[PDB]
Symmetry: T
Subunit: 141 residues, 12 copies
C-alpha cells in the first residue's frame, strides 16, 4: 500500500531559512525520515515536492486513479487555490492536510484553507512529525 506525500510551493526551501518557525531539517532529509518511518509501518511512501500548481494537480489526479492516500502540505496554495481543492475532492482514499508551523498563530489570512473542508483531517503545528503522525493515521486505517 502506497501513500503519496505531496509538498507544494516553498517546501523545497525547507531548513534553508527561518529555523525558528519551520525547523532546521532539509527537504531531502525529510524525504528520508518519511520513507524510513513509512517502511517501519508497513507502508510505501512516495514523497514529491513542486513549486508548480499544474504538477501538483497532476499528482493529485494520479492518486485519485490509483486510489492512494494523500498527505498534502500545499504551503501557500492552501489559502488560495480552488483548483487544488477540486482535484483533491476527487480522492477516495483519505486526505490528510499537514502544516509544519502553527498557522493559527500567524497572519489572519493563514487561518483559512480551502483544503480542510475536503480533507479527512489536518495536522497543524507539530513540525516535521505531523507527516509521520499522518502516516500512523493511515497505517491504522
Amino acid at each position: 500500500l502506497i501513500v503519496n506525500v505531496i509538498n507544494g510551493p516553498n517546501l523545497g526551501r525547507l531548513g534553508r531559512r527561518e529555523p525558528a518557525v519551520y525547523g532546521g531539517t532539509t527537504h531531502d532529509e525529510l524525504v528520508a525520515l518519511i520513507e524510513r518511518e513509512a517502511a517501519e509501518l508497513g507502508l510505501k511512501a512516495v514523497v514529491r515536492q513542486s513549486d508548480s500548481e499544474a504538477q501538483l494537480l497532476d499528482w493529485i489526479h494520479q492518486a485519485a486513479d490509483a486510489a492512494e492516500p494523500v498527505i498534502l502540505n500545499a504551503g501557500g496554495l492552501t489559502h488560495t487555490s480552488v483548483a487544488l481543492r477540486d482535484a483533491c475532492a476527487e480522492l477516495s482514499a483519505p486526505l490528510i492536510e499537514v502544516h509544519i508551523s502553527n498557522v493559527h498563530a500567524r497572519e489572519e489570512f493563514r487561518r483559512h484553507s480551502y483544503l480542510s473542508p475536503i480533507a479527512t483531517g489536518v495536522i497543524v503545528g507539530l513540525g516535521i512529525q505531523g507527516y509521520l503522525l499522518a502516516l500512523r493515521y493511515l497505517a491504522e486505517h
Copy 2:
C-alpha cells in the same frame, strides 16, 4: 512525565447518541485506549472530562503549575471561551488541541477556535486516534 488529557462539554457522551460524525468509540473506551498507548509510549496520562468551564480551568491551572503538557478537546468551548484560552496561555509545556471530527467540514462558526493560536499545534478530523497521535508527538518532545 505526565500528560494531561482534558475533554470539554459533551465529550462524556461520546459513542452514545451520535456516531457518524464522532465515531463509535465511547469515552470509557477511549480512556482505555489512552492508557494502553501511554504504556507503549513509556509515559503516563491522566484523562479527565467535564461539562464545566470552571472545572476545565482548574485542571489547566494545575497543569500549568506542574509544568505538564496538555492535550485539550474543549468541545464547543473552543469556539467561544476566551477564559479557557487565557488559562491555556500560561502553560509552559506544549499544548495540543484535538478535535475528533473535521470542524472545517461543518458549520462555518466551527472554523474559528480561540485555542488554536496559543497552542503548539492542532489535530482535527483524525477521529479518536487524534488523541493517540498527540500523545506520540509529546513522547518525542
Copy 3:
C-alpha cells in the same frame, strides 16, 4: 408523558425588575403555572432553572437519553453557547426554544441564536404565555 422545561441564567430573577420587559410573575409562580397547565393537558412538566451552563447540559443529556421533549429558555446562553447547541442537537423529541421578551426589538446581538437552527421551533415576545403555548404544541406535535 414527561416534558422538560429548562430555564438558564438570570431566569431565577423573573419578577424582580424588569417590570417591564419580562412581566411581574416570579420564577416560582411560573414554575407552578406551567405545572397546572401541563396537567390540564395530560402532560407532566419538570420545570428547572439554573445559572450553570454545566447544569443545563446535564439536563439536556437526560432528556436526550429519555427521548423527552424540551422547552428551553437558555437566557443569555442562547447567543453564546456552542456547547448548549451541541447537547440539544442530540434530542430526538421536539425542542422548542422560548424567549419571554421580543429579542428582535432589543440589542442586535440578541437577534442571533445558536439554538434556533437546531430547535423544532422558537417562540418570542409572547411573554410568560410562550411557555404555555409550547406545552400546547407538545400536547399535539
Copy 4:
C-alpha cells in the same frame, strides 16, 4: 373580538409542495382549523391571502383603522419589504409574526426579518399550529 390572519406570497401553495418543510396541510384546510379554533375561544377569524404586496398593505391599513389584532405570515416579503414594516408599525393592537417552517435552519437570508422588531411576538417552526397558538395568545392578551 375580530382577528385578522394575513398570509402573503406563496402561502397559496401550502401543502402542495415540499411537505417536508411546510407540511401537508393545504391553505384551505388551515383556514378551516383557524376558524374552528377561533370559535372555541370566542374570536372571529378573518383569514386572508394574497401574492401582492399592495393587497397586504391594504389589509394591514384596514386593521390599523379598525384597531384589530393581526396574525401575519408575510412569506417572502418578511425578508425584503420595508413598506410592509412601515404599514404594521401603525397597528395599535398586537401583531404576531408566524412562520410555518423554522427559518433559522434554512438559508442565512431567511434569518433576518424586517417585521420581527416591530411585532409583539414571533412564532416560528411550529407548523400550522403556529397560527392556532397565535390566536390563543390573542384570546388571553
Copy 5:
C-alpha cells in the same frame, strides 16, 4: 409645464393615522397644497399615490415617454426596489427624491437609497414643504 408628483406605499395614510413624525396633513390636503403652489409658479402638478410598485413603474414609464419631471417619494420602496430605480433611470427630465422625515435619523437600513444615485437630487426631513421646495427647484430648471 407638467410636474409629476408620485407617492409610494403608505403615503395614502398621511397624518390620519400616523401622526407621528409626518405632520397633521392628510394626503388630500397635500394634493391641494402642491396644486396651489405649482399653479403659483407656472406649473401644473399631477399628484398620484399608490401602494403598488407596478403602478409606480407605470406612472414613471409615462413620464419618461412624456419627458416630464418627477418628484418621487417612493417610501419603503426607496430602500429595497431595483425595478423602481431602473424605471427612473430612463427619465430624461429631472428626478427629485423626497422624504418627509429625516431617514438618516432613524434605523440603519433607511440610510441607503436605490434612487438617490440616479436622482438629480434629494430632499429629506423638511416635511410637506419637501415637495414645495422641489417644485421651486423645477420651476427654475
Copy 6:
C-alpha cells in the same frame, strides 16, 4: 411542448430605452423572434411581460402545476425577491434565468441573484440571443 418565457419589471420598454445596454429590439419583435425560433425547434413558446411581482408569481405557479419549463428574465426582482425565488423553487421542469446585459459589468448589487441558486442554469450578457439559446437547451433537455 409548451415553454413559458417570462419577463419582469421594465422589460416592457425594451428597445425604447438604452441601446447598446439592452439593444434596439422592442418587446414585440422579441416575442416574435422567440415564437418563430421556438417552432423551428418543435416547441410552443408562450411569452409574457409584467411589471407586477404578483402577476409573475401567478405565472410561475401555473407553469409549476402544468410541469412546464420556464425561461425567466426577472429584471430588478432578480436581486431583490425571495418570493419570486420561492415560487421558482417549486418548478419540476427546468428554470433558466436570462439577463440581456452582462449583470457582472455593472453596479455591484446587480451581481447577486436570488434566483440562480434555484435555477437549472443562467445565461448572462449575450443580448436577446440568450432567450433563443435557452430554448435551444430545453428542446434537448
Copy 7:
C-alpha cells in the same frame, strides 16, 4: 431672524474648479445670492466659509448660544468629523445640511455623513439653489 450659513473646507474654491460637479458661480456670488434671497424672505443671512474645522466649530457654538438656525455645508468634513456632529447636535434651532452635488452618485464614501442623523433635514444635488431652498424652509420653520 438671523440665519447662519456656514461653508466648510474647499468651498472658497467654488466656481474655480469642477464646474461640471460644483456649478460655476463663485463663493462671492453665492454670499450675495443668499443674502439677497434671505432679505426677500424677511431674514438676515450671515454666510461664512472656512477650511478650518476649529473655526467652523466656533461659529457653530455661537449659533448654539444665540439659538439661530444653521444651514451647513461641511464639505469634506461631512463624512469624517465626529467633532462637527457633536457641535451641531447642540443647536436647538433647525439645522439643514446642504450639498451642492448629488453625493449618492459619486464615490461610495460620500454617501455616509456623520451630520445627517442630527440635522433637521438634508438637501443634496440641487446645486447652489439648495442654500436658497433651505432659506425658504427656515422662513416657515
Copy 8:
C-alpha cells in the same frame, strides 16, 4: 472564424469522475462534439485543455494577437485569478465564460468570478451544451 475553446484545471478529468454535477462525457468526447458543431456552423474550433495557468495565458495572448474569440472554462481559476482576468481583458473578439455546473448552487466562494466582469456574457449550468450555445452565439454574433 477560428474560435478557441479553452478549458482550465481539472477539466481533463471530465467524464472520468463524477457526473451528477458535470455529466458522463470525457474531455475527448467533448473535443469531438465541439468540433462537429463548430463545423456545422461554419467555424473552426481549436479546443485545448491545461491545468497550467501559464499555459492558459499563453493561449489567451495568442488569441488576443490573432483577434480570435475565446470560450473559456477556467475551472477553479475563475474564482481566484486576476492574471487570467488581465489576460482576457485585451481580447477584442468576444469572450464567453462557460461553466458546466451551476456555480450559484454550490459553495458561496464559487459565486464570484474575476472573469464575468470582462466577458461579453456567461453561460452557467447548462452542461456540455454550454459550449455549443456559446458557439452558436459566435456564429450569429
Copy 9:
C-alpha cells in the same frame, strides 16, 4: 456602604505569572490592599473571586437585592458573556468595570465588552490601582 469587588476567571492566578501584563501582586495581596484602601476611605469592601460564571451570577444577584455597588473584572467573560451582562444590568447601585491590563492594546477581540454598555464606567490598564480608583469614585458617589 458595602462595596463588592468581583473578579472572575483566571484572576486567582494573579501575580503568579505573565507579570509584564498583570503584573506582580497576587490575589491575596490585592485583597488586603483593596480592604486597607476601602477602610481608609470609610467603606467596607467584600472581595470575591471565582472561575465559575454561575458563581459570578450569584454574587451579582446578591448585590442587586442588597442594592450594593459592584466593582467587576469579569476576565475573559467580558468579551463573551451575555449572561453576566444581563445580571449586572439589574444593579441599582453604580457598576464599575475594571481591567488590570490595557485591553485596547492587545488582541482585537479583547477590544469589545458586553459589560461596558451597561456599566457606570470602565477603568482599563491602570493596573491594580484600577480597583482603588473605582473605590475612590464610589466613596464620592
Copy 10:
C-alpha cells in the same frame, strides 16, 4: 511636579448642554477642580482646551519634549484622528485617556478609539471625576 491635562474639540462647551450625559459643571469649573485637586496631591496641573487639532498636536509635542504625563480627553478626535494618535505614540511619560461619558452606552462609532492602544490606561463614564482619578494614578506612582 507637572501634569498636562488636555481637552479636545467641544469640551469647552462642557455643561452648557445635555447635562446628565456630561453633566452640569462648566469647563472653567473643571479647570479649578483639577488644579486644586492636583495641588492637594503635590502636583501641578496645566489644563487646556482647544477645538483645533493642530493646537492639541502642538501641546502634545511639548509634553513629549518635556517628558511630562498627559491626561487626554480628545473629544471628537478620539474616534477619527490618526495625526493625534501619532503625536501621542511619542509620549514616554504616562498617557491616560479620559472620557466623561460612557462611550459604550452610546452610538457604535464612539466605541472605537485610535488612542486607547497607545495609552497607558483609559477611564470612561466616571464623569468629571475621571480626570481626578487619573491624577491620583500619577500621584501614587511618583518615584
Copy 11:
C-alpha cells in the same frame, strides 16, 4: 519650474524621534537635501510643513492656481481626510504621494489612503529618499 513639497502633521518631528521608523534626518536637514537635489535637476523645491489641515489645504490651493507639481506627505491625514483628498483632486500637474515608512508593514488602518486614488502615483517605505525619487519623476514628467 517649481515643485511644491508639502508635509503634514507630525512631520516637523522628523529624526527627533524614532531614528528607526523614519531615519535620523531632521526636517531642516530634509529641506536642505530636497532643495539641493532639486537644483541639480533644474527645479525649485518649496518645502513646507504644517500640523494644520487648513494650512495644508491652503498650500494645495496655491499649487492648483500656480498649476505646479506637488509631492505630498500628508502624515496621519492620508488615512482620514476627504477635505485634503478633495483639495488635491483639483491639481493639474502631477501629484506624488510620499511615505517615509512602509505603511503596509504597520497597522491595517495605515493601509488605506484617501489620497492615492487621485495621485499620479505613490512612493512608500523608501525613507527620506522617496522625496528625491519623486523629484526625478517630476524632472522627467
Copy 12:
C-alpha cells in the same frame, strides 16, 4: 552588485496594448532601458519575466540564496499569491514592489497586496520610471 528585476504575468504584453494605463514601451525595450540605466548607476541588472508562478519563485529562491536585491512587479499574482509572498519574505537584501499603473485608482481588488507588507518599499503609478527609481534607491543601499 547584481540586481534582480523580476516581472510577473501579463507583463510580457507591455506596449502590445492598453497604452492609456501601462505606456507604449514594450517588454524588450524595458529590459534594455533598465539594463542600461542600472549600469550608469554601477549595477548589473538581471531582468526577467515569466507568466509562470513556479518560474517566478525559482528566481526569488535564487536571489535569497545569493542575498541579491530584488525589484518585483508580480503583476496579477500581486493580489492573490501567498506562495510568492512567502518566497519574498526570505529575501535578506531589499525588495522593492513596483507597479506601472496606479492600482488605487482602479478596481477595488487591486488595492490589496500580499507582497507590500513584506517589502521594503512600494512604487505605484510612476509608469516605467518606477523601475528606474527603484534602481536609484538600491544604488544607495
